[PDB]
Amino acid sequence: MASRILLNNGAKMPILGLGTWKSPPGQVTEAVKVAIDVGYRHIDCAHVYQNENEVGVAIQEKLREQVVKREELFIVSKLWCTYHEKGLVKGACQKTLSDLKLDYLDLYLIHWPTGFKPGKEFFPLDESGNVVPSDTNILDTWAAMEELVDEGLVKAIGISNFNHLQVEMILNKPGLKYKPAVNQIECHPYLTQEKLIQYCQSKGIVVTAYSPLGSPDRPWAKPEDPSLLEDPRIKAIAAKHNKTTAQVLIRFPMQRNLVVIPKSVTPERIAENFKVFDFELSSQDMTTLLSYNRNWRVCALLSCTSHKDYPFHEEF
Ligand SMILES: NC(=O)c1ccc[n+]([C@@H]2O[C@H](COP(=O)([O-])OP(=O)(O)OC[C@H]3O[C@@H](n4cnc5c(N)ncnc54)[C@H](OP(=O)(O)O)[C@@H]3O)[C@@H](O)[C@H]2O)c1
Ligand SMILES: O=C(O)Cn1c2ccccc2c2n[nH]c(=S)nc21
Ligand SMILES: O=C(O)Cn1c2ccccc2c2n[nH]c(=S)nc21
């Protein structure tokens, strides 16, 4: 298992990264410092996570300390939904660069295919509670992303939460200049995503699996919800390999040629989650894990089901 995967822009992306959604601003600086100290070279960020400044403090300290060189890091962020307007894309990227204290991103993603009305609110609502959409065509947003490559702000561009028809729309864009390098999507044994993954891979688009542990800290979690980390079948596979359930859950997407971005702010877990390059799940193990699919989606964007570009009505 090589540590990096080749992207269609010619750059190599570390297959393991640190997630930062929900990482409290008072804990994420140390989390990122620890991650870099124990070998992580890829950090997954977003403006909407409200902690890019604090992530940036950690990156900057580790660069200053010469623990790692900038070229060895792979920093990813994402364009929020309220910045899909073509004229707002560059400023959104620049704000993220300023907070992260970087002069380029390795990868910048359209966070969701749904554009919202611009403004200070991340989820602008009408008086009846519906999200207020943007009229900006995703193809125009893509053209604005391509400009960021040409102006040196980002090395690669990609998409997130795009269904196969939405990916296809980008791939079929008249005058397409740069293909998406990555589609970042939810993926774990309860939402195995075989159809979308095969589609993306067949087009040379690398898939990043998010919420690989089932996002047990998602704010809308219910006590009775399924729990990957507590699934006795997955526990048994872990025990067979003398690994933790989390380690199996992280190794699983790696062996499907995916990138994976588990989140933790706990130093012991950040280290545990990185120790996944010393064992191999069997083909049987892999198929068995795939068999647990229930089409259970922890990030379903229920707030936006009425939006014309809501991605999850389609089968895949
Ligand atoms: N593009 C998108 O729309 C999108 C959506 C969702 C997520 N993401 C990205 O994907 C990242 C990962 O997804 P996620 O944050 O939703 O959830 P996740 O990585 O599946 O799970 C995070 C949870 O698991 C716990 N955890 C981590 N390692 C553990 C271990 N070894 N043992 C036991 N528990 C462990 C963490 O606790 P502690 O932190 O307390 O240690 C936290 O509560 C996000 O942070 C974000 O960067 C992107
Ligand atoms: O977009 C993300 O990366 C995670 N995330 C969020 C991150 C920050 C703020 C809101 C959200 C959110 N709301 N719904 C869903 S399904 N996922 C959400
Ligand atoms: O609607 C969203 O954008 C996120 N979200 C929520 C946001 C606020 C309150 C509840 C939820 C919720 N419940 N289930 C799921 S899959 N997603 C949820």
Side-chain angles (χ1 to χ4, degrees), residues 91-116 118-119 121-128:
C93 186
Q94 290 176 316
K95 171 57 170 164
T96 278
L97 286 170
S98 177
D99 288 345
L100 292 170
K101 293 161 281 283
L102 301 173
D103 56 14
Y104 68 92
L105 296 174
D106 296 274
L107 178 64
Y108 197 49
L109 305 177
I110 303 181
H111 202 149
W112 293 84
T114 52
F116 303 164
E121 297 169 343
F122 291 155
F123 285 84
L125 307 181
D126 63 30
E127 294 181 30
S128 304

Short mmCIF file of all heavy atoms in Angstrom, two decimals, residues 91-128, unseen atoms left out:
data_model
loop_
_atom_site.label_atom_id
_atom_site.label_comp_id
_atom_site.label_asym_id
_atom_site.label_seq_id
_atom_site.Cartn_x
_atom_site.Cartn_y
_atom_site.Cartn_z
N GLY A 91 -12.65 35.39 -4.03
CA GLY A 91 -12.61 35.95 -2.69
C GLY A 91 -12.78 34.90 -1.62
O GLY A 91 -12.12 34.95 -0.58
N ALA A 92 -13.65 33.93 -1.86
CA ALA A 92 -13.86 32.83 -0.92
C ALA A 92 -12.57 32.02 -0.77
O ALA A 92 -12.16 31.67 0.34
CB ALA A 92 -15.01 31.96 -1.36
N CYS A 93 -11.93 31.72 -1.90
CA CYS A 93 -10.67 30.99 -1.87
C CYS A 93 -9.60 31.80 -1.12
O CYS A 93 -8.88 31.26 -0.28
CB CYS A 93 -10.22 30.66 -3.29
SG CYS A 93 -8.77 29.61 -3.36
N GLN A 94 -9.51 33.09 -1.42
CA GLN A 94 -8.53 33.96 -0.77
C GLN A 94 -8.73 34.06 0.75
O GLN A 94 -7.76 34.12 1.50
CB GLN A 94 -8.53 35.36 -1.39
CG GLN A 94 -7.97 35.43 -2.81
CD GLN A 94 -8.09 36.82 -3.43
OE1 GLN A 94 -9.12 37.49 -3.32
NE2 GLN A 94 -7.03 37.26 -4.10
N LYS A 95 -9.98 34.09 1.20
CA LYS A 95 -10.26 34.10 2.64
C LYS A 95 -9.76 32.81 3.30
O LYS A 95 -9.14 32.84 4.36
CB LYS A 95 -11.76 34.31 2.90
CG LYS A 95 -12.23 34.12 4.35
CD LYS A 95 -11.51 35.00 5.35
CE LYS A 95 -12.20 34.93 6.70
NZ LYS A 95 -11.34 35.46 7.79
N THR A 96 -10.01 31.68 2.65
CA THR A 96 -9.51 30.40 3.14
C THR A 96 -7.97 30.37 3.16
O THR A 96 -7.37 29.93 4.14
CB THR A 96 -10.11 29.24 2.31
OG1 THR A 96 -11.43 28.95 2.80
CG2 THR A 96 -9.26 27.99 2.40
N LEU A 97 -7.34 30.87 2.10
CA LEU A 97 -5.88 30.94 2.07
C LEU A 97 -5.34 31.82 3.19
O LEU A 97 -4.34 31.50 3.83
CB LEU A 97 -5.39 31.48 0.73
CG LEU A 97 -5.48 30.51 -0.45
CD1 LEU A 97 -5.21 31.24 -1.75
CD2 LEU A 97 -4.48 29.38 -0.27
N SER A 98 -6.01 32.95 3.42
CA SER A 98 -5.59 33.88 4.46
C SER A 98 -5.71 33.25 5.84
O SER A 98 -4.79 33.34 6.65
CB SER A 98 -6.43 35.16 4.38
OG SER A 98 -6.09 36.05 5.42
N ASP A 99 -6.84 32.59 6.12
CA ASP A 99 -7.03 31.91 7.40
C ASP A 99 -6.03 30.76 7.60
O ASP A 99 -5.47 30.59 8.68
CB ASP A 99 -8.46 31.38 7.54
CG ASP A 99 -9.50 32.48 7.76
OD1 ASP A 99 -9.14 33.64 8.07
OD2 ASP A 99 -10.69 32.18 7.61
N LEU A 100 -5.82 29.96 6.56
CA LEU A 100 -4.89 28.84 6.65
C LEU A 100 -3.43 29.29 6.63
O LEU A 100 -2.54 28.49 6.92
CB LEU A 100 -5.15 27.81 5.55
CG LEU A 100 -6.47 27.03 5.66
CD1 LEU A 100 -6.70 26.23 4.39
CD2 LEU A 100 -6.44 26.12 6.87
N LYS A 101 -3.21 30.56 6.29
CA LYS A 101 -1.88 31.15 6.18
C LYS A 101 -1.01 30.46 5.11
O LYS A 101 0.18 30.19 5.29
CB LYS A 101 -1.22 31.24 7.56
CG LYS A 101 -1.95 32.24 8.48
CD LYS A 101 -1.64 32.02 9.94
CE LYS A 101 -2.43 30.86 10.53
NZ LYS A 101 -3.85 31.20 10.84
N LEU A 102 -1.65 30.20 3.98
CA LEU A 102 -1.00 29.54 2.85
C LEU A 102 -1.04 30.42 1.62
O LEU A 102 -1.89 31.32 1.52
CB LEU A 102 -1.72 28.23 2.53
CG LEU A 102 -1.76 27.21 3.67
CD1 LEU A 102 -2.65 26.03 3.30
CD2 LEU A 102 -0.36 26.75 4.04
N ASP A 103 -0.14 30.16 0.67
CA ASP A 103 -0.19 30.86 -0.61
C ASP A 103 -0.75 30.01 -1.74
O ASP A 103 -0.92 30.51 -2.85
CB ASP A 103 1.13 31.56 -0.99
CG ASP A 103 2.33 30.64 -1.02
OD1 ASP A 103 2.18 29.41 -1.02
OD2 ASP A 103 3.45 31.19 -1.08
N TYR A 104 -1.04 28.74 -1.47
CA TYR A 104 -1.85 27.92 -2.38
C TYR A 104 -2.51 26.79 -1.61
O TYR A 104 -2.03 26.40 -0.54
CB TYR A 104 -1.01 27.36 -3.54
CG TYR A 104 0.01 26.31 -3.12
CD1 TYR A 104 -0.30 24.95 -3.13
CD2 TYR A 104 1.29 26.69 -2.74
CE1 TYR A 104 0.63 24.00 -2.75
CE2 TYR A 104 2.23 25.74 -2.37
CZ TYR A 104 1.89 24.40 -2.36
OH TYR A 104 2.83 23.46 -1.99
N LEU A 105 -3.59 26.26 -2.16
CA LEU A 105 -4.18 25.00 -1.70
C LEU A 105 -3.77 23.88 -2.64
O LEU A 105 -3.64 24.08 -3.85
CB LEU A 105 -5.71 25.08 -1.73
CG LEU A 105 -6.34 26.11 -0.79
CD1 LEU A 105 -7.82 26.16 -1.03
CD2 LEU A 105 -6.04 25.78 0.67
N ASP A 106 -3.59 22.68 -2.12
CA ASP A 106 -3.35 21.54 -3.00
C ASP A 106 -4.61 21.10 -3.74
O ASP A 106 -4.53 20.63 -4.88
CB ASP A 106 -2.74 20.40 -2.21
CG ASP A 106 -1.38 20.77 -1.68
OD1 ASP A 106 -0.40 20.59 -2.42
OD2 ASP A 106 -1.32 21.29 -0.54
N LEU A 107 -5.76 21.30 -3.11
CA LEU A 107 -7.03 20.89 -3.68
C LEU A 107 -8.13 21.78 -3.12
O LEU A 107 -8.22 21.99 -1.91
CB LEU A 107 -7.30 19.41 -3.36
CG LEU A 107 -8.62 18.80 -3.84
CD1 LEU A 107 -8.72 18.79 -5.37
CD2 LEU A 107 -8.75 17.39 -3.27
N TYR A 108 -8.99 22.28 -4.01
CA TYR A 108 -10.13 23.09 -3.61
C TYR A 108 -11.37 22.47 -4.23
O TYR A 108 -11.42 22.25 -5.45
CB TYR A 108 -9.94 24.54 -4.08
CG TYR A 108 -10.82 25.58 -3.42
CD1 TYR A 108 -10.96 25.65 -2.04
CD2 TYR A 108 -11.47 26.55 -4.19
CE1 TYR A 108 -11.74 26.64 -1.43
CE2 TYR A 108 -12.24 27.54 -3.60
CZ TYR A 108 -12.37 27.58 -2.23
OH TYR A 108 -13.15 28.59 -1.67
N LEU A 109 -12.36 22.19 -3.39
CA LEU A 109 -13.57 21.47 -3.80
C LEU A 109 -14.80 22.37 -3.79
O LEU A 109 -14.96 23.19 -2.89
CB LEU A 109 -13.83 20.31 -2.85
CG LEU A 109 -12.71 19.30 -2.63
CD1 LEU A 109 -13.09 18.24 -1.61
CD2 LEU A 109 -12.31 18.64 -3.95
N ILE A 110 -15.70 22.17 -4.75
CA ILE A 110 -17.05 22.69 -4.57
C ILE A 110 -17.71 21.83 -3.49
O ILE A 110 -17.86 20.62 -3.68
CB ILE A 110 -17.88 22.66 -5.87
CG1 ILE A 110 -17.18 23.45 -6.99
CG2 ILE A 110 -19.25 23.24 -5.59
CD1 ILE A 110 -17.96 23.49 -8.30
N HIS A 111 -18.06 22.43 -2.36
CA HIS A 111 -18.41 21.66 -1.16
C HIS A 111 -19.68 20.84 -1.36
O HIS A 111 -19.74 19.68 -0.94
CB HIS A 111 -18.55 22.61 0.04
CG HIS A 111 -18.39 21.96 1.37
ND1 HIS A 111 -17.87 22.63 2.46
CD2 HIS A 111 -18.70 20.71 1.80
CE1 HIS A 111 -17.87 21.81 3.50
NE2 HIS A 111 -18.37 20.65 3.13
N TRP A 112 -20.69 21.45 -2.00
CA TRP A 112 -21.95 20.80 -2.36
C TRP A 112 -22.38 21.34 -3.72
O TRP A 112 -22.03 22.47 -4.08
CB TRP A 112 -23.05 21.13 -1.34
CG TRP A 112 -22.84 20.54 0.03
CD1 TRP A 112 -22.08 21.06 1.04
CD2 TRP A 112 -23.37 19.30 0.52
NE1 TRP A 112 -22.10 20.22 2.13
CE2 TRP A 112 -22.90 19.14 1.84
CE3 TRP A 112 -24.22 18.33 -0.01
CZ2 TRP A 112 -23.23 18.04 2.62
CZ3 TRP A 112 -24.54 17.23 0.76
CH2 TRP A 112 -24.05 17.09 2.07
N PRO A 113 -23.17 20.57 -4.47
CA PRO A 113 -23.63 21.07 -5.78
C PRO A 113 -24.70 22.17 -5.66
O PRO A 113 -24.98 22.86 -6.64
CB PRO A 113 -24.22 19.82 -6.45
CG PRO A 113 -24.63 18.92 -5.30
CD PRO A 113 -23.56 19.16 -4.24
N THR A 114 -25.26 22.33 -4.46
CA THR A 114 -26.32 23.30 -4.21
C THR A 114 -25.77 24.71 -3.92
O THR A 114 -25.07 24.91 -2.93
CB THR A 114 -27.14 22.86 -3.00
OG1 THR A 114 -26.25 22.59 -1.91
CG2 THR A 114 -27.90 21.59 -3.30
N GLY A 115 -26.08 25.68 -4.77
CA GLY A 115 -25.73 27.07 -4.50
C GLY A 115 -26.82 27.77 -3.70
O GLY A 115 -28.01 27.57 -3.95
N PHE A 116 -26.41 28.60 -2.73
CA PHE A 116 -27.35 29.35 -1.90
C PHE A 116 -27.15 30.85 -2.12
O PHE A 116 -26.08 31.28 -2.55
CB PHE A 116 -27.11 29.13 -0.40
CG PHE A 116 -27.16 27.70 0.08
CD1 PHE A 116 -26.63 27.40 1.33
CD2 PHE A 116 -27.73 26.67 -0.66
CE1 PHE A 116 -26.65 26.12 1.83
CE2 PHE A 116 -27.76 25.36 -0.15
CZ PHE A 116 -27.21 25.10 1.10
N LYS A 117 -28.15 31.64 -1.75
CA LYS A 117 -28.05 33.10 -1.76
C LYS A 117 -26.82 33.58 -0.98
O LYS A 117 -26.60 33.14 0.14
CB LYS A 117 -29.31 33.70 -1.14
CG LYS A 117 -29.35 35.21 -1.16
CD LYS A 117 -30.54 35.75 -0.36
CE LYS A 117 -30.22 35.79 1.12
N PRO A 118 -25.99 34.44 -1.59
CA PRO A 118 -24.83 34.98 -0.88
C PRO A 118 -25.20 35.83 0.33
O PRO A 118 -26.30 36.37 0.40
CB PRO A 118 -24.15 35.85 -1.93
CG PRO A 118 -24.53 35.23 -3.23
CD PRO A 118 -25.93 34.73 -3.04
N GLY A 119 -24.27 35.93 1.27
CA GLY A 119 -24.48 36.71 2.47
C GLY A 119 -23.73 36.09 3.62
O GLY A 119 -23.00 35.11 3.45
N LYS A 120 -23.93 36.64 4.81
CA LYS A 120 -23.20 36.21 5.99
C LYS A 120 -23.67 34.85 6.51
O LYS A 120 -22.90 34.13 7.15
CB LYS A 120 -23.31 37.26 7.10
CG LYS A 120 -22.71 38.61 6.74
N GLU A 121 -24.92 34.51 6.26
CA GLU A 121 -25.49 33.26 6.77
C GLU A 121 -25.13 32.09 5.88
O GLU A 121 -25.30 32.15 4.66
CB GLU A 121 -27.00 33.39 6.86
CG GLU A 121 -27.43 34.47 7.84
CD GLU A 121 -28.90 34.79 7.75
OE1 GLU A 121 -29.52 34.43 6.73
OE2 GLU A 121 -29.42 35.42 8.69
N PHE A 122 -24.65 31.02 6.50
CA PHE A 122 -24.28 29.82 5.76
C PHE A 122 -25.49 29.10 5.15
O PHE A 122 -25.35 28.46 4.11
CB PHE A 122 -23.52 28.84 6.65
CG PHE A 122 -22.15 29.30 7.07
CD1 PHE A 122 -21.59 28.81 8.23
CD2 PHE A 122 -21.41 30.19 6.29
CE1 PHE A 122 -20.30 29.20 8.62
CE2 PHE A 122 -20.14 30.58 6.68
CZ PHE A 122 -19.59 30.09 7.84
N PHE A 123 -26.64 29.20 5.80
CA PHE A 123 -27.89 28.59 5.34
C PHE A 123 -28.97 29.66 5.34
O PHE A 123 -29.77 29.74 6.27
CB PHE A 123 -28.30 27.42 6.24
CG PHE A 123 -27.49 26.17 6.04
CD1 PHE A 123 -26.27 26.01 6.69
CD2 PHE A 123 -27.94 25.15 5.22
CE1 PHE A 123 -25.52 24.86 6.51
CE2 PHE A 123 -27.19 24.00 5.04
CZ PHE A 123 -25.98 23.86 5.68
N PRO A 124 -28.99 30.53 4.31
CA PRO A 124 -29.99 31.60 4.29
C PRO A 124 -31.39 31.02 4.12
O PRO A 124 -31.60 30.17 3.24
CB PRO A 124 -29.58 32.43 3.07
CG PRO A 124 -28.88 31.45 2.18
CD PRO A 124 -28.16 30.50 3.09
N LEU A 125 -32.34 31.48 4.93
CA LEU A 125 -33.69 30.93 4.92
C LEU A 125 -34.72 31.94 4.48
O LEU A 125 -34.58 33.14 4.77
CB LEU A 125 -34.10 30.45 6.31
CG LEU A 125 -33.16 29.48 7.02
CD1 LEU A 125 -33.74 29.10 8.37
CD2 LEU A 125 -32.91 28.26 6.16
N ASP A 126 -35.78 31.48 3.81
CA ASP A 126 -36.96 32.30 3.63
C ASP A 126 -37.78 32.27 4.92
O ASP A 126 -37.44 31.55 5.87
CB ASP A 126 -37.77 31.95 2.36
CG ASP A 126 -38.35 30.53 2.34
OD1 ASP A 126 -38.67 29.98 3.41
OD2 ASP A 126 -38.54 29.98 1.22
N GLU A 127 -38.84 33.07 5.00
CA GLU A 127 -39.60 33.18 6.24
C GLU A 127 -40.30 31.88 6.62
O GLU A 127 -40.71 31.70 7.78
CB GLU A 127 -40.59 34.35 6.16
CG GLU A 127 -39.89 35.71 6.09
CD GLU A 127 -40.87 36.86 6.03
OE1 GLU A 127 -41.98 36.73 6.59
OE2 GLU A 127 -40.54 37.90 5.40
N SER A 128 -40.41 30.96 5.66
CA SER A 128 -41.05 29.68 5.89
C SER A 128 -40.04 28.55 6.16
O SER A 128 -40.42 27.39 6.30
CB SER A 128 -41.96 29.32 4.71
OG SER A 128 -42.92 30.35 4.48
#
